[PDB]
Amino acid sequence: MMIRGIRGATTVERDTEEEILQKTKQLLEKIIEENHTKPEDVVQMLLSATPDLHAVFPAKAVRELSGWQYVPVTCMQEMDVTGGLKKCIRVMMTVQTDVPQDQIRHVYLEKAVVLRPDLSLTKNTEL
Amino acid sequence: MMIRGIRGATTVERDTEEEILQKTKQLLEKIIEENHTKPEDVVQMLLSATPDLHAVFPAKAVRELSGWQYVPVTCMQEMDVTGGLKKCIRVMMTVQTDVPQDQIRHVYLEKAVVLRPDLSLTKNTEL
Amino acid sequence: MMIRGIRGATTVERDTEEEILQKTKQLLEKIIEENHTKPEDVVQMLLSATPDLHAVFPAKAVRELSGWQYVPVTCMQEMDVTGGLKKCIRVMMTVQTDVPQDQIRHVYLEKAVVLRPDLSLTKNTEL
């Protein structure tokens, strides 16, 4: 049937394997929870990292998640945009689903919450 | 019906936000003109930029295109190839469509016209 | 029919066009033979290269393979992980197939044999 991309993004405080794995895992887990995604219905996944992250391939966390051992995943370098979010891991998970495009739940965590499309910037936060 | 990739590429003269969004929008518009693509039929999109481009994520132009705000898109850095076309933006748009693979209209604009494969289906269907 | 990614990887001894095309073509042919892949059933392909490879886009091997000239493909840079495999080409081939996720045959050649899930761990018996 129809297939849909699911986006997510998250950040780490430091380029360490523990942080990259933990935050990638948490991001994937939230995407799964919000979209009700079963690993057998995942076509494939891509994860990107900004060029300030080198400790580990974030795909390791996907490969270790129980039940996800056959999900095809690979990584890539995000483009280096001047002023772009630093230490950022992004997902493109492709899933078989009947859920319409405008109801798919994309997930933005940690410092990537500023990437939510739903928000306008608050001009005065205090009064 | 089936899912198919549509490829595009374009270039800019300068690493500026207005040029990268303008040429990326024009490339998407041309893809829509030629393939008749409706945003809800797009599974997902990937945009790449050569590493001489840093001013903006080209995906911004997709996110701002009227009706396309729910199309999942993310970017990546293109490889740096010796002699590779400079200042180039490429797209891979994954869509649901019944158009056969050899009729999908891949779009090469600006200096990326040098990338077109110049295939001959008139001959390939025969010999 | 379901869509599924197929993963592959290989390596070259030298960053030359000749070796990159030779080893990418070998990798493609092996994926095709293990999965019985027909080009019209390929949605699209992505190929990544480590940042030590500049001589050619590995996608040239796909564009030049007989009957694959309408398979949409594009490339990206793999992320630079410390101690990541050097001179490595990775593939994500998206295909229409009824084969179960756990029976897809992912192909890892040359020095990328260490990326086989069943070999990646062998070193744990030794150090």
Side-chain angles (χ1 to χ4, degrees):
Chain A
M1 47 125 152
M2 188 52 180
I3 67 173
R4 301 289 174 188
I6 316 183
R7 278 303 317 294
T10 193
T11 59
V12 299
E13 290 291 310
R14 13 265 198 284
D15 175 27
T16 68
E17 177 183 33
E18 187 272 358
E19 284 191 25
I20 296 171
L21 291 184
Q22 184 186 61
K23 295 322 186 166
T24 297
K25 175 188 80 178
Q26 286 175 347
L27 175 64
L28 178 51
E29 292 180 342
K30 187 68 172 158
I31 275 77
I32 293 158
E33 173 245 339
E34 300 194 8
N35 291 280
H36 303 203
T37 306
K38 301 170 165 7
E40 61 265 33
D41 297 327
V42 178
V43 174
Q44 66 189 225
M45 182 182 337
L46 302 172
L47 292 266
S48 75
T50 45
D52 46 16
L53 291 178
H54 309 286
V56 70
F57 290 100
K60 176 166 174 176
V62 183
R63 292 183 187 120
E64 291 191 341
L65 187 64
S66 193
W68 283 69
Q69 57 269 27
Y70 301 113
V71 172
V73 53
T74 199
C75 307
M76 59 199 188
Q77 217 146 90
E78 168 68 292
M79 68 171 285
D80 191 0
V81 168
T82 300
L85 195 56
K86 288 72 57 251
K87 297 169 181 108
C88 182
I89 301 143
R90 298 176 172 73
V91 168
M92 181 74 84
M93 179 182 331
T94 308
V95 310
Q96 183 185 56
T97 185
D98 280 345
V99 173
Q101 177 178 268
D102 68 6
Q103 290 183 264
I104 299 288
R105 294 188 197 146
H106 303 108
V107 172
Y108 299 106
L109 303 178
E110 307 296 339
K111 296 177 187 190
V113 294
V114 307
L115 297 172
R116 303 152 47 207
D118 357 1
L119 295 177
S120 56
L121 30 77
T122 290
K123 190 172 167 188
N124 197 319
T125 59
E126 304 271 15
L127 59 88
Chain B
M1 196 77 56
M2 173 52 173
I3 308 302
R4 303 274 167 207
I6 314 186
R7 279 293 327 290
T10 188
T11 59
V12 295
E13 291 292 281
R14 313 185 279 167
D15 180 24
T16 225
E17 175 183 40
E18 89 81 22
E19 286 194 20
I20 296 163
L21 298 184
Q22 175 187 103
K23 290 313 169 200
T24 297
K25 179 180 180 170
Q26 289 177 164
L27 174 65
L28 187 43
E29 291 173 305
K30 188 70 159 172
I31 294 182
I32 294 164
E33 287 160 359
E34 308 196 345
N35 295 281
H36 314 112
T37 312
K38 302 182 136 302
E40 60 272 31
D41 288 334
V42 179
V43 175
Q44 66 185 226
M45 301 180 36
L46 295 177
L47 283 155
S48 79
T50 41
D52 48 18
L53 296 182
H54 308 284
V56 68
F57 296 96
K60 177 169 169 173
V62 182
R63 304 187 176 110
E64 294 185 333
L65 187 68
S66 180
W68 282 65
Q69 63 266 41
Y70 301 104
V71 174
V73 61
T74 201
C75 305
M76 53 198 191
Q77 197 160 101
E78 167 71 291
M79 287 170 70
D80 196 355
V81 166
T82 304
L85 184 65
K86 299 275 217 23
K87 298 185 189 62
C88 181
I89 298 151
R90 294 168 169 87
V91 59
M92 181 74 78
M93 170 177 337
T94 305
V95 308
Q96 183 184 232
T97 180
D98 41 347
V99 177
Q101 181 180 262
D102 74 11
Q103 296 294 283
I104 302 292
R105 301 302 289 296
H106 306 109
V107 174
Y108 301 103
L109 302 177
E110 303 299 344
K111 299 175 178 168
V113 74
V114 303
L115 305 182
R116 70 183 297 193
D118 296 327
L119 300 169
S120 171
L121 197 49
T122 285
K123 172 180 190 179
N124 197 74
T125 57
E126 302 274 23
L127 294 151
Chain C
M1 181 174 311
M2 182 54 175
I3 310 298
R4 295 216 181 266
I6 308 172
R7 276 299 324 288
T10 189
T11 62
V12 292
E13 281 300 296
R14 298 299 301 275
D15 178 30
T16 58
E17 179 174 32
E18 192 159 14
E19 293 200 7
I20 294 167
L21 299 180
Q22 173 194 52
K23 297 313 188 176
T24 302
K25 175 176 187 182
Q26 177 186 67
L27 173 62
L28 303 169
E29 295 183 337
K30 188 62 175 186
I31 291 169
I32 294 164
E33 77 93 2
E34 295 195 12
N35 291 282
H36 301 74
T37 314
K38 297 150 152 9
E40 73 270 15
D41 293 328
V42 181
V43 175
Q44 65 185 231
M45 300 174 50
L46 300 174
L47 285 85
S48 68
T50 42
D52 46 15
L53 294 182
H54 310 283
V56 72
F57 290 99
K60 172 171 176 168
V62 182
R63 301 197 179 104
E64 285 185 326
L65 195 67
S66 300
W68 284 65
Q69 62 267 37
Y70 299 101
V71 176
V73 57
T74 200
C75 301
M76 74 287 215
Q77 199 170 276
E78 169 67 294
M79 78 182 272
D80 188 15
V81 170
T82 302
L85 191 52
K86 301 177 345 144
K87 293 185 180 79
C88 181
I89 299 107
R90 291 167 174 86
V91 177
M92 179 80 74
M93 182 189 301
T94 309
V95 308
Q96 183 182 225
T97 178
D98 61 359
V99 174
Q101 182 177 259
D102 65 2
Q103 282 170 59
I104 300 287
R105 293 179 83 214
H106 302 105
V107 177
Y108 305 99
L109 313 174
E110 310 289 343
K111 298 176 184 168
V113 293
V114 69
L115 308 178
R116 294 178 182 193
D118 71 13
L119 280 190
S120 169
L121 7 292
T122 300
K123 112 167 190 170
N124 297 333
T125 64
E126 306 272 15
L127 52 97

